[PDB]
Amino acid sequence: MKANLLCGNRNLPKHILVEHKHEHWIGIDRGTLILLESGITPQFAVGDFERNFIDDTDLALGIDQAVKRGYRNIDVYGATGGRLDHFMGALQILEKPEYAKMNINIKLIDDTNEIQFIQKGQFNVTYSEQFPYISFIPVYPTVISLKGTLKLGSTLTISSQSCGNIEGSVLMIRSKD
Amino acid sequence: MKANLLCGNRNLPKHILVEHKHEHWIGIDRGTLILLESGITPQFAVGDFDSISDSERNFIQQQIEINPYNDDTDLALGIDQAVKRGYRNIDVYGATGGRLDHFMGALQILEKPEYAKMNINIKLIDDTNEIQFIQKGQFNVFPYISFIPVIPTVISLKGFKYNLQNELTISNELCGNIEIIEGSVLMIRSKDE
Amino acid sequence: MKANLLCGNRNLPKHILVEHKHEHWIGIDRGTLILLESGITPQFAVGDFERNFIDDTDLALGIDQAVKRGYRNIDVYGATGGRLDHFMGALQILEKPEYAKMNINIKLIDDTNEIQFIQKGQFNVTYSEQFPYISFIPVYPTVISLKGTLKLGSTLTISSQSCGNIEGSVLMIRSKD
Amino acid sequence: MKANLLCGNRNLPKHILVEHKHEHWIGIDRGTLILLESGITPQFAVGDFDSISDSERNFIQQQIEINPYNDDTDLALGIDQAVKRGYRNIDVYGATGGRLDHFMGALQILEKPEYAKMNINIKLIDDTNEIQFIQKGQFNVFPYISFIPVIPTVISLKGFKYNLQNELTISNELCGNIEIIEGSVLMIRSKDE
Amino acid sequence: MKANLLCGNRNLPKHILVEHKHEHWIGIDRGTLILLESGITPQFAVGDFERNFIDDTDLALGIDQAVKRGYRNIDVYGATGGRLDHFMGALQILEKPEYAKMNINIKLIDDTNEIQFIQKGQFNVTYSEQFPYISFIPVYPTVISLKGTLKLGSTLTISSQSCGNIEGSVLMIRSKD
Amino acid sequence: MKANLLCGNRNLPKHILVEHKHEHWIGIDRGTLILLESGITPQFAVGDFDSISDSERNFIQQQIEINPYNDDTDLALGIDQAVKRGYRNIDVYGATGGRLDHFMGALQILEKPEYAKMNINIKLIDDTNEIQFIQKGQFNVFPYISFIPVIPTVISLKGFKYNLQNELTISNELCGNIEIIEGSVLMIRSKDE
Ligand code: NA
Ligand code: NA
Ligand code: NA
Ligand code: NA
Ligand code: NA
Ligand code: NA
Ligand code: NA
Ligand code: NA
Ligand code: NA
């Protein structure tokens, strides 16, 4: 089951709320209000502006509840822009070791990016129409692909499928040109 | 048709918002924002409720906020407004604890005669109690049960004695009969804490 | 809360029923049938072709019930055209002294007009894109604006904001050119 | 699944259309137009019902009007048609007053054996009464209660005597037991007017 | 009342599921799944991939239940293409003598045809915009129109209204050019 | 909030899918496909369930199929997953007949202590029975009733004797009282076949 979380209205892909109006949506803080104003009933909501559902941030809470509720595909919207600590809080979540063993998939999506946390191992990467660039950001991580503090463009802006093997852990970022 | 009113977040039965998320909910004052925050759309709301942006207030004050003309408390209007829409069973949550002058006002509403003649069922509910008004007449049936007079002769059966008992049974424990020969009494059911 | 009343299908603004399909609608007489045929469930309906809700016309009844139900913004559609006594009955409503004290706002809207009853006092008037003309029709009413039985074009076809003060009462009509 | 049928506007419990506006409603003859007029969309309707324009009749006779093949009265078809869709609890309103030959036909339906074997619950209801058929067997439980035989031995408890009483109790007043040893009886509950 | 049956996804008129999303739909076998995937709740469904509703094929069952439920206008979609025995099974249904006496109307519709079983008697035929051709296929049937094993183009591809009288029984087929 | 679970098609009460077509349904293993086939959309489903095309599996495994992390049987996860969403009354259908080791596992779930403290009501149901767990305490109330101990002193009233009866009443026939002084018992109601 796929879960769509909305925790803001900044940088949202176009028509995301109308093209996906009948999917499972979850409100996070202010995202809840936006969903209601768009005629969408949230499966559940978290954060003020909730607590009786069932140390942590509202988004960490909402995602944890999604995971516990069996969702395997979790896409987070409205988590980039404005206050950046909120965006960093999101990246933290993706890193929780608890979501490592599980066969879960969480990603932050905005009108220009798609962020995922690729852990130690080997994964495949299919091409995409709107997302030409790919970049890996270590969270010592050594990697091997089909073309090969640290601040190098070595594993940044780069363009079937390919293999990505990590001999630590990184954040995979796909972005539009 | 059943309506649930939320007046705030004190002594609320745990999980009451998740367990009845699809029923009809009415927001009274602070209850309004708690409903929305839980992703619940109130059929309507009464109360000055705070806003954080025009986009919001515009939303709430056009599809949720009603403005009954009145005098009466926000809860009393919410009730009347629910009865006007055909709601027959009303459960008020969030009306206990804190400032007791309000809890008391909530009791005045249950006692309004305008509801006795009608076939309305109003109950105040929190995590430990259930309260309702019972007028002159005969009726049947939280291990504890108590009757408090409002304005009263009473006769009970399955509980204990009480025969033509004038107004004790301020904590009974019992498919049961109770007849109000005269006056009126509030019935309050409690759980064993 | 805003209430939308439908008591006919003549002169309705374009796409009013599809662009506003999720707002609060009230049926009045035949308007009820039109709403049902458009997939809209009326909050309530009045008039035959209802009475157990809760001397007067069906529309006076429906609007009175709206007012009693706390609606502050009431827009009436389908009240112009065809039988004119029905349109005049509508204008009567706007005039009820009962809706004077209250902070209510009622208006008749059709594809070309927007009629409101401005009572004794002083009100403001914002400009509008589709409605360039403004006209005041007394219901002895003396007025003072930003440009200044009786049948004069003095207070008729006339084009930020402006002040309208009434030293009796009039009907304000905004119409498209 | 519960279905309410409207056969007309006589002796209807006050506010029955507002108070149950969201339940499933079926229109029988004139009931059809009363439902719609109240802004209620019938799940389906039986009956020649009048029209005032093709636009309307087209609407009603394509999304509301069904045409069961039959013989049986319009109400009897409406019932069968509700049972075919899985409705187990049926409340018929509007079937009392006026021409009594119809009220009687409505009683014949409750007595159809085709419903005894099934687990259907059909009740006729108006502002003062509630009526249902009770077949051979034992069952339990408007201050007044009366039993009228249809084709009958009976035994009651909480009411009064009645022990192996052959077919009086045409106005009882009483969490109660009743056993039909033989035959069948209509049970009618009334209120104190 | 009109009933729409869906028992497949081959040769469906364009946008049938979106333009008619709010009408009464019935699922038949796989049609059920297609309806659910299109956001449509079937009044009821028949066939595996149901039986406790209330010798025969799932479509014969679904249509019989429609007829018993009082539907007078029954349009069948997705019954042409792929396995042809399934299409022939459909034609059989249209022929059931049981649906002769009744004032019922059943037809198979696809993006190019509209098939109906005209029995012994006399019927009228209105023109249509998208369907210019008409053809009659006997199911000894003698006919008389406004222009007049057997394998003749005499009563095939042929183009107000007209009269069609049958002095046995035939299948009327209207098709696009 | 009420949830119905379907685990398969054995001993199902006839018409259970048509009569409750609009309630909330959860699919467990084979129950999933039976729900869909009947044109019913499950709130969610647990179980490897078969597919016949990617289009389908994609559909089911994105809007219906959930994957709780676990160990526990598919039915036990379905239950927990329903309780997590706020479902308080759970009716499990399709869990009897066939391989009894499963029927037994279904009984273990009703006995989980994690549900005793909470205010959840889980019942196993088929065309002839209704089964539920009853913990230490006092409670009230298919002509046949039986109590089977799980881990037990008991006292019944309206049925027959049973006073401080230690753990017979493996087929009672009776607005009734039962108190578990010690231990726990499964209550099973049966119909007369
Ligand atoms: Na959920
Ligand atoms: Na109540
Ligand atoms: Na307190
Ligand atoms: Na309303
Ligand atoms: Na009933
Ligand atoms: Na009468
Ligand atoms: Na149907
Ligand atoms: Na249960
Ligand atoms: Na068995």
From TrEMBL, chains B, D, F:
The keyword rRNA-binding does not apply. Keywords: ATP-binding, Kinase, Nucleotide-binding, Transferase. It is an enzyme of class 2 (transferase). GO terms for molecular function: ATP binding; kinase activity; thiamine binding; thiamine diphosphokinase activity. PANTHER family: THIAMINE PYROPHOSPHOKINASE (PTHR41299). It holds the Pfam family TPK_catalytic. InterPro entries: Thi_PPkinase (IPR006282), Thiamin_PyroPKinase_B1-bd (IPR007373), TPK (IPR053149), TPK_B1-bd_sf (IPR036371), TPK_catalytic (IPR007371), TPK_catalytic_sf (IPR036759). GO terms for biological process: thiamine diphosphate biosynthetic process; thiamine metabolic process. SUPFAM superfamilies: Thiamin pyrophosphokinase, catalytic domain, Thiamin pyrophosphokinase, substrate-binding domain. Its EC number is 2.7.6.2. This is Thiamine diphosphokinase. Residues 137-186 form the Thiamin pyrophosphokinase thiamin-binding domain.
